[PDB]
Amino acid sequence: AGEHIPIVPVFGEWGFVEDKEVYEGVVRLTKDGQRLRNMIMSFNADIV
Amino acid sequence: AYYENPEVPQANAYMLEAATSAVKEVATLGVDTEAVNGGQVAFDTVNQ
Amino acid sequence: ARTPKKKPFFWPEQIAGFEHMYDGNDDYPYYLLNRTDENSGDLPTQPL
């Protein structure tokens, strides 16, 4: 029944790397720093 | 003579410093205003 | 993750028959190594 596409995606910062799409929330590469802590946590648990 | 366990190397401690700073880095976009309208301001403008 | 960490060195001729005295569990409150060896005996000097 629309006269335009009724589906509106909301984005954070939105754009292209060059030609591939990329967008980010507040979680994008947050994943990196969590894994360093988890690394030390898993290894030292084995020592204990 | 008494058994000496791994005491957790200085390399592990150096990585803990890099780990704690990394996880909070992306996680906070940048608090513009305390409480409401924090790091979500970038999302809020494009959402409306 | 990868590196050997602080654990006692031994010789293969003084760790012979000891593998229940190291396992990472409490089956023991002490350790045992070979004090003397054939082809001139030995005495403890902390040989580890």
Side-chain angles (χ1 to χ4, degrees):
Chain A
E3 295 198 312
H4 303 76
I5 306 180
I7 307 186
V8 278
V10 286
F11 297 105
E13 285 80 10
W14 178 74
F16 295 94
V17 186
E18 280 81 45
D19 295 295
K20 183 186 169 180
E21 182 183 11
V22 61
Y23 50 84
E24 50 187 355
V26 81
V27 180
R28 183 57 182 94
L29 268 72
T30 318
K31 311 184 290 183
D32 285 291
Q34 181 61 254
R35 289 176 199 291
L36 276 67
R37 302 179 66 146
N38 294 2
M39 177 183 64
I40 301 166
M41 198 178 204
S42 296
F43 202 85
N44 293 352
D46 179 60
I47 301 175
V48 168
Chain B
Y2 289 82
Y3 198 104
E4 301 180 1
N5 289 244
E7 303 291 70
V8 182
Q10 299 182 48
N12 295 32
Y14 185 86
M15 282 301 296
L16 188 59
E17 293 173 0
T20 52
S21 299
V23 65
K24 61 186 292 183
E25 199 65 64
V26 187
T28 302
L29 187 144
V31 181
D32 297 292
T33 305
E34 301 181 359
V36 296
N37 300 106
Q40 59 168 28
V41 175
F43 312 144
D44 189 61
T45 307
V46 295
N47 187 3
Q48 57 175 102
Chain C
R2 304 186 303 178
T3 187
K5 303 181 179 186
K6 179 169 284 293
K7 282 183 161 59
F9 297 172
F10 300 124
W11 293 306
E13 295 175 54
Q14 68 177 357
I15 201 57
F18 302 115
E19 65 295 298
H20 183 69
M21 303 305 296
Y22 307 87
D23 57 357
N25 299 297
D26 187 64
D27 292 351
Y28 44 86
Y30 52 79
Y31 299 108
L32 296 167
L33 296 169
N34 297 112
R35 196 180 187 187
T36 46
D37 286 77
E38 61 182 0
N39 301 113
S40 304
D42 296 292
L43 291 173
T45 49
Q46 301 184 60
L48 44 66

